[PDB]
Amino acid sequence: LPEPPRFVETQTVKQIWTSMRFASLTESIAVVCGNPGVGKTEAAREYRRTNNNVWMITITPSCASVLECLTELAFELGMNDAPRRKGPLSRALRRRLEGTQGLVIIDEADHLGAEVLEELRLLQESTRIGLVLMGNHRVYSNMTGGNRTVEFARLFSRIAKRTAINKTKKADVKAIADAWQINGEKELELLQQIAQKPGALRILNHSLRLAAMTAHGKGERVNEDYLRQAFRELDLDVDISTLLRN
Amino acid sequence: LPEPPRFVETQTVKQIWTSMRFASLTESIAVVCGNPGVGKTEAAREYRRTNNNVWMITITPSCASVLECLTELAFELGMNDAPRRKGPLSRALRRRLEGTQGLVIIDEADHLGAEVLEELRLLQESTRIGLVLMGNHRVYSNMTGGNRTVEFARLFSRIAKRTAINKTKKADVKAIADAWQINGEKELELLQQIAQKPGALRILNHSLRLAAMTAHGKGERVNEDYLRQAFRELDLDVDISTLLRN
Amino acid sequence: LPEPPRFVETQTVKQIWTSMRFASLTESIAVVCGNPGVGKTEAAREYRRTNNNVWMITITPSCASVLECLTELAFELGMNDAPRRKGPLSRALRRRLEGTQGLVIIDEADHLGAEVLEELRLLQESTRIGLVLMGNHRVYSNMTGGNRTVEFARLFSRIAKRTAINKTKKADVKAIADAWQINGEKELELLQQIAQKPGALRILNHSLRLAAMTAHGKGERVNEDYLRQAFRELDLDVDISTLLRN
Amino acid sequence: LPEPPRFVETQTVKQIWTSMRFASLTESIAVVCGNPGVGKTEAAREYRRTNNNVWMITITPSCASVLECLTELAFELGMNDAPRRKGPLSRALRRRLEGTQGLVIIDEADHLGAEVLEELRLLQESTRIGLVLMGNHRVYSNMTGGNRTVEFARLFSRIAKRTAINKTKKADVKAIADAWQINGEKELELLQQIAQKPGALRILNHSLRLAAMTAHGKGERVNEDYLRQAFRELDLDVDISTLLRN
Amino acid sequence: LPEPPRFVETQTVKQIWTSMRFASLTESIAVVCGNPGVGKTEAAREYRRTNNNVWMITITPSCASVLECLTELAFELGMNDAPRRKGPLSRALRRRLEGTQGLVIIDEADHLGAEVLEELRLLQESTRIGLVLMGNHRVYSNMTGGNRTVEFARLFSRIAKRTAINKTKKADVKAIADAWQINGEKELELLQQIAQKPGALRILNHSLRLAAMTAHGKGERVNEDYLRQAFRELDLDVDISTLLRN
Amino acid sequence: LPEPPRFVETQTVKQIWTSMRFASLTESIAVVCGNPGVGKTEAAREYRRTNNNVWMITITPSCASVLECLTELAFELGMNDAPRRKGPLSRALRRRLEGTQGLVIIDEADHLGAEVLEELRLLQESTRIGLVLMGNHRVYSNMTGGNRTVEFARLFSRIAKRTAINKTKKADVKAIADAWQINGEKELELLQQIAQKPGALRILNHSLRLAAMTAHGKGERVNEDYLRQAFRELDLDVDISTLLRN
Amino acid sequence: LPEPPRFVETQTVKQIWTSMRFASLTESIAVVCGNPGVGKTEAAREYRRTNNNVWMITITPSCASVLECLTELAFELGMNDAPRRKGPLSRALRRRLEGTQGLVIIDEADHLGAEVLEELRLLQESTRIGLVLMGNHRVYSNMTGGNRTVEFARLFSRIAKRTAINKTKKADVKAIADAWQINGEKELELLQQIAQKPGALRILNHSLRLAAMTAHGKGERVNEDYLRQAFRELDLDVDISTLLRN
Amino acid sequence: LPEPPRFVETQTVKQIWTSMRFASLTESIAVVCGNPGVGKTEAAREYRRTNNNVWMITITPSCASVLECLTELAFELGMNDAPRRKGPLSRALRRRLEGTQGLVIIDEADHLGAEVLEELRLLQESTRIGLVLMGNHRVYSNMTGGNRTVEFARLFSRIAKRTAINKTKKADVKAIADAWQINGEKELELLQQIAQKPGALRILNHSLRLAAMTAHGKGERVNEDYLRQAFRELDLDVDISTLLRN
DNA sequence: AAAAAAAAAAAAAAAAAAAAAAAA
DNA sequence: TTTTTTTTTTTTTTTTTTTTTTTT
Ligand SMILES: Nc1ncnc2c1ncn2[C@@H]1O[C@H](COP(=O)(O)OP(=O)(O)OP(=O)(O)O)[C@@H](O)[C@H]1O
């Protein structure tokens, strides 16, 4: 019956916000790398919404070059009239970002190459801001493993605080259930089981939203039956590569 | 005598449409991969024609790169003046697709590489639309099987609902026959046999259209004789790799 | 004395033309694969000459990639200003070929790989034209034999009608002899014997042209003697790999 | 005393020129494969010099790929600004060689692989010219011997006339002696003996040139003594793999 | 006391140089293969130093492929900007080497395979230069012995003059002693005995240089004692595979 | 109490250094092969440390191919940006090593095959450096024994000085004891007895270090008791293949 | 009732740990070979878990080659992006393992061939770590017995400490019983008798776990009856090769 | 009249299932070997069908090597894109089977060699699954009899539970008859007599199916007459050896 | 012990034609 | 006009190796 909670401050969200606060305070690059669906992107979005002078961009493979990444950062800054060349855009970003003590949150930073990462590191160094590189466990692995540990030496030195989010914690699903008004022990155990699945918090949110929608359509309250039905839906455990083969 | 039916709503078509509706509502990526000639592309085309704010593109090996796939998507959107660079085109697609709650159906998505699939994934994430990847069993097999379950981890994580179409069901051919005005039990059995041949509805439609054309030319009604003649035609059981040796 | 016939409509030519007409009407891929020198390439050329909206290309190993094959198809279309990229060229071909109900005859289609064949079948599907793959037994043997029957599954399902030309039939050589004004039973027997040689119809044409040229030079009518002299020429039965050894 | 004859029209040269004329007239591939030092390369060079619209290239192992062989052919054609890709170069060759009824002489053609030979065959077919292939017995042995006769089936069918040069005939050495002003019966017998050695005509030419140079230096006429001295030179009968052992 | 002679024109050097001049004049391939330490490499180096338009390369097992061998030849030619592909490099070598009547000296030619030797032979044929191949008995043994006499048939036919250097002759050591200011009969006998050892002239030069260095250090003239001490050094007659066992 | 000596100059070390100086001066290949644990590798390492323009590499079975051995040599040279192909890397090594009169110490050279040994031999010949092969008796045994004395003929001829180290000499262990401050006659006899054990100097060093560590832990001086305890340790006389059986 | 102990520090475990510590300190190869089921692999695993900079790999017959064994070691090191060639992987291992003074425990080292054992020995030499070879009596028997004591001479010389585990000792089973809370003298005697059976500690662990499971299911305490039932199970005394015959 | 039962849960099937459960629980290898046709393979297949995370492969002499056996195991796992090398395939199997608590049943394991059995044992050890060897008495006889019991010592120690199936038991045929709706005492005696014949359950099933087919053809019920006729059929007592010679 | 066959397959160039948008 | 870039790619192979097995 109640409207779904758009965002809840879980333990993982609190840790990620602490990492971003440290990055903005010490003015050094921070790495927030975790497995998919652990609450990273929504934590970054909520941090951007609730904190002034915080700018967040995502790195698509189309915006994975220096000019396109700088243009994305400028568009996030509101500089809709930014120059379309590398040098003028870099200088405009240096002028606009300086003196703000901001926090440029590079979501999906694993797509960044060496040149773009060097450009971002130089921008942070000459701007004195926080640069939170996000993504998956490839963010750290890109800066280590042979020739990459000497080319990325300066960038790896800039990294002050690094956070690894392996799996969604029990406190996270507990907070989500509390925000969803769920009290049943069986329901909590089912939510915890859904959490350990790949795409942890995404699958948890999909199951919760589908169960809430089904209960609202049927005019009843959400219980373990609706959660189980939603989790059995989505065909998560379907080996569809073998279904077509056989 | 009556005109052939352009499209008939079948069980497989209904399941695919349910998957599309779920993808558009939940705003998460869905996978619809089936064996050749099971009714995926035609159902997707009918969904696009009957529903507003629904966009369909096909992924040829020529349009299997980020720039070309984004250009195809823009051309589907009606943005005939789309930018020719990766970044500006991605931003234009983000502005155009946002706020529509649409459904971008990526037909033949098995041709997409890691880069293009990742870019489309990020576009869906930052746009809040539904992405329906189609093709064959290789769509799922690309995202699983070793090193590709950690590179495609995030893309696998967004996948909300996946639908398997191994072979066309009896209800599908029953609906096709009813739309074709076929009542004979022998004709129904012949259609059922025709469906299980490789390329189920491709061969079924070819045989039905040929039988109808032959009957109309001869001025008679369609019966089992014309169906059998059409099925014996098309040389499906011709091992044309051995008619030359022997 | 009479001028040689540049082309004669025969049984093999009639069957190949029936296959091409079926491919153009049903708008589905057709395969015309036979042994060398049976009357396939000339049949396709004559079909292109006598039928409008019919475009024929040959696939050299240099034009066996997607970009080069699409450029060859565009040049056949008269699009001498075709784009030099894969995507723009594919879209230009989609625009130009659409609405014509044409017939793209891919001569020597055995050279095409999986990528180019997949691109061509997708172009045919999105354009609603007839695609005729031509060549030798490898045209079909490429789409069967293990992993190639599941990668080429959709393309194999596209194949509506497949025609095998193992050896030149008796009616074919009879029609050619009639076009060459040959009545002698011994001459017909010699022509039939010449046909069964490898490179059947090429050897037939070479022998006929040589005999006609020699008879015209000598001022006499063509008879079995000139045919025998021409056939004993061309050194068909010369084991030239053992003449050097011995 | 008289200057050596650069080229003399021997019987083998006449046969090779007849094969070349037949290939250029019939517009079909011809094979001229013989033992080393029989006069094939010099006959081809003289044919190219004395006949217009005749182009000759040689196939080194570096120029044994499609792009490099096509570039060699273009450079022979005088197209010094030829494109550096397979497709554009093939199309440029098709445009330039078409309408000339020329004769593309492929010297050392046994080095061509299946791909390059197939491309050259298709170029000849779509250009209507004469392709002449030479080398050693491996030219024919490449297109025969099991799987090689079904892969090279079309190319073997193209072959109109094939000429074998096992060893230089008595007429060849007779013509060479006549051009060299040699009348002695012992000298003719010695030249015939020199011919039967491996590398027949190369050894013959080397011996004749050495004898002529020695006679000119000594101010005398060439006789059997100088021929014998030259033939005992060149160390043909030196088992140098055993001279080091013993 | 006097400085050692860098190079002395021995009888073996004279014979090798005669072979080089014959190869450069006749413009045909020559082979100079002999046992280790006989003076072939130094003779080639001195010929390159004292004669213009003479190019010498050595064939390491890394430079035993067509591309690397052609790059070595180009670097010897001074073409420091040679193309890195097979075809363009071959054409550049053809253009640069043509019209010079040079002498491409292939040291250690026994490492060349069939492909590289074939390419070098065709380069010499189409360039009209002299190709000199050195090494050991395996240079000729590679072109004879079964299937190797028919694959290497043309290359064997090209060979104009082949020179065998089994062991250094008495004239060689006599000239070396004369250049070294050695007159004692015992010293001459000791040098002759040193020559017959494996690595004839390598050991001879090493012993002479060591004796001269020791005499210069002691301030005396070189005599039989110093040569004997040097020859007893170098541990030539040490069965070092048995000193460890016993 | 005193720190262990890192390295001590002994008779075997002096002989090996004399061989290395001879190889670097004469610019010819030298062989230093001996039984395991005789002081070869440490002598080579100390020579590299104390002498400029001296480069040492070891040949692991993975680095026993031409490309990998050349890459090892380049990495020893400091060429961290060396090319990854055989030819360019060989030319880079030729350029870098030339004009230095250096000494390439090939430790564990018995793992090199014919190809890699030939490449290193030609590199030394074209560079005028000292190639000091090292290892065990197989270094020489690979170059003799039938067909191996004619394939390795040039390499064997180039071997200037070969040094055999069967067992560590009495002077070697005497110098080691002097560096270890050992005066007891019983201790000297025990060290000599330890020397004759297999892995002579490895075992001697292990025993000395263990005795010194035990004495330092107990606060006493090293005597015969500690050496005997260390030698009874290390379980050299344990027939561990019969302990498990019994 | 109490949970089973995952690991107990037996006397054999203490001896194996002493050997591993000696190998890591002395930086020399150690051998831990014994009869199966004595407590070797679990001791190595526990040592790896409790000590930092300790890497343990196992040698399957598929991982018995140099490349696969080095890849196994790299994967144990944590570099999932290790190069797949012999040389680059060896250099990456040398770089990563250097400066750590680690302990690479090669479990099941009896499967290693001469090449792989030599490569691991050289890696340990150039890295200064402790290589602990494990397995059965064949580990030593591979390095002794004729030709194998001279090829494996260096590897045998580098073996610092070798430890024999013939059978599980009384102290080991006493410690296991103490960790299992077993006090009965009859139970202790039964455990001792179980130990002397082949596969000593595997059988002991299986019997103890089955007895504990049966007691927990029946709600009683483990005594002599449950251990006797478990030992009579597992069908150790079943001559199953004679049951089928009779 | 009733359809034949596909499977019946017999006493032998129950014992085999108990052995498989024990193997999957104790995480140790189990051996299920018996006489041919005693209900082993079908019991294993039924257990695989009715249990999750259970994988069954058969070992034929074609797939009796390490690479092919691992490929078959991977194909059973559904990894149709498994690597083709020994090491990568072994690592992929280790990653896929780890944590699944699986049970790999190796049907007809007597064909496995020492290398493949060792690889499977190490895979089970490092994966913690249940390896069920299967076949005939050779499975155990390969692990005992001299040198085979010291080479297979570890594998023999790994074997937890071994089950012998000498012949089909009375309860087995009783359950089969009950599932086949047979009540006659004479029919039961005939089935029992059929069971003791070689190929016990294969022969019993063949006789029962033939009798049922004959009864259905004649429209009567199965009784002793039909079973006797079926048993006299199949030529079980026909000695082919003596009829042909005589 | 010796010769031949059938793969996987992974790292490394390099090089050349085509727009193609934008600022002064 | 003048320039600045820029980026996107598409093909070019090229090699180096790395077993895997299979038989005689
Ligand atoms: N429970 C059962 N009910 C009916 N038939 C059975 C049953 N178990 C086995 N069979 C029959 O046994 C035959 C083959 O299975 P079975 O286990 O006897 O083979 P096997 O000789 O052990 O096999 P292999 O030696 O190849 O592993 C079939 O005819 C099958 O019908």
Side-chain angles (χ1 to χ4, degrees), chain G residues 41 45 58 60, chain H residues 23-24 26-28 53 55 70 73 77 89-104 119-131 158:
Chain G
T41 286
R45 261 174 200 158
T58 184
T60 77
Chain H
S24 178
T26 317
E27 306 304 336
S28 179
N53 271 359
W55 307 280
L70 290 190
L73 183 58
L77 291 178
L89 179 47
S90 183
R91 292 179 209 101
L93 293 201
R94 274 191 51 260
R95 181 169 35 237
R96 163 72 180 79
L97 297 145
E98 211 166 30
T100 61
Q101 283 304 0
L103 181 71
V104 171
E119 162 65 74
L120 268 296
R121 173 255 293 183
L122 290 173
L123 183 63
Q124 173 257 323
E125 164 162 278
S126 81
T127 318
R128 285 189 334 277
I129 67 190
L131 194 65
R158 204 89 42 191

Side-chain angles (χ1 to χ4, degrees), chain F residues 60-61, chain G residues 70 73 77 89-95 97 104 117-129 131:
Chain F
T60 77
Chain G
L70 290 192
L73 189 44
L77 288 180
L89 186 41
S90 189
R91 290 177 209 102
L93 294 202
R94 183 180 63 83
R95 265 202 319 253
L97 293 172
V104 171
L117 263 176
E118 207 164 12
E119 163 65 76
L120 271 296
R121 175 257 291 181
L122 274 152
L123 190 67
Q124 175 259 321
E125 196 193 299
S126 81
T127 303
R128 289 187 335 277
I129 60 181
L131 196 69

Side-chain angles (χ1 to χ4, degrees), chain H residues 6-10 13 35-43 107-108 134-135 176 201-202 205-206 209:
Chain H
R6 64 157 312 258
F7 190 89
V8 57
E9 184 169 307
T10 76
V13 159
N35 276 339
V38 297
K40 288 172 320 196
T41 287
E42 271 296 324
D107 200 4
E108 281 277 43
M134 261 195 88
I176 297 169
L201 188 49
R202 279 172 158 170
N205 176 37
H206 282 316
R209 291 187 180 283

Side-chain angles (χ1 to χ4, degrees), chain D residues 62, chain E residues 57 63 65-75 82 85-86 89-90 93 116 119-120 123, chain F residues 91:
Chain D
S62 50
Chain E
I57 67 168
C63 317
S65 61
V66 173
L67 175 49
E68 308 302 333
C69 171
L70 289 189
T71 304
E72 274 290 321
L73 187 48
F75 275 43
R85 315 221 81 81
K86 289 176 159 192
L89 187 39
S90 189
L93 291 203
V116 178
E119 160 66 72
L120 281 174
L123 188 67
Chain F
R91 293 179 210 101

Side-chain angles (χ1 to χ4, degrees), chain B residues 9-75:
Chain B
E9 284 201 20
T10 76
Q11 175 190 2
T12 288
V13 161
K14 274 182 179 181
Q15 159 184 6
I16 289 182
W17 278 2
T18 287
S19 190
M20 299 214 177
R21 286 181 216 287
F22 178 81
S24 172
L25 183 63
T26 309
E27 273 141 29
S28 199
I29 294 185
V31 160
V32 182
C33 50
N35 279 344
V38 296
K40 293 167 319 194
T41 289
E42 263 301 320
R45 263 173 205 157
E46 197 55 35
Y47 197 85
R48 167 177 74 165
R49 204 221 61 220
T50 61
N51 277 312
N52 65 330
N53 276 358
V54 163
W55 307 283
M56 184 153 191
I57 80 166
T58 186
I59 294 307
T60 64
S62 48
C63 306
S65 63
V66 175
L67 175 50
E68 309 301 334
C69 174
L70 288 189
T71 299
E72 265 292 318
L73 190 42
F75 275 44

Side-chain angles (χ1 to χ4, degrees), chain B residues 1-5 177-184 187 208 210-228:
Chain B
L1 182 60
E3 295 300 319
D178 295 330
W180 266 104
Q181 295 168 355
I182 285 178
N183 305 116
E187 287 138 16
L208 284 159
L210 288 191
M213 180 168 79
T214 307
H216 196 186
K218 215 179 290 184
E220 321 177 352
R221 270 292 186 184
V222 185
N223 49 49
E224 203 267 355
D225 318 308
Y226 298 89
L227 263 49
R228 207 92 187 186

Side-chain angles (χ1 to χ4, degrees), chain F residues 118-191:
Chain F
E118 214 162 16
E119 162 64 71
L120 282 169
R121 184 251 291 171
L122 273 154
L123 189 65
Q124 177 257 322
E125 182 179 1
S126 82
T127 314
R128 295 191 332 278
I129 55 184
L131 195 67
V132 175
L133 314 167
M134 277 171 98
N136 64 345
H137 65 281
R138 260 210 286 142
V139 172
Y140 172 97
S141 162
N142 275 340
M143 304 159 178
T144 316
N147 186 236
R148 270 160 281 112
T149 199
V150 300
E151 182 190 22
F152 285 98
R154 275 92 53 79
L155 179 53
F156 197 52
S157 66
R158 214 161 320 260
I159 292 177
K161 183 140 159 61
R162 60 198 77 179
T163 53
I165 320 293
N166 201 354
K167 305 142 297 182
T168 48
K169 297 108 195 165
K170 267 73 59 185
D172 193 344
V173 293
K174 185 44 169 45
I176 297 169
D178 291 330
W180 266 103
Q181 288 171 352
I182 285 179
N183 295 113
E185 197 271 298
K186 298 286 208 92
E187 294 143 18
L188 188 139
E189 194 44 75
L190 185 43
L191 290 204

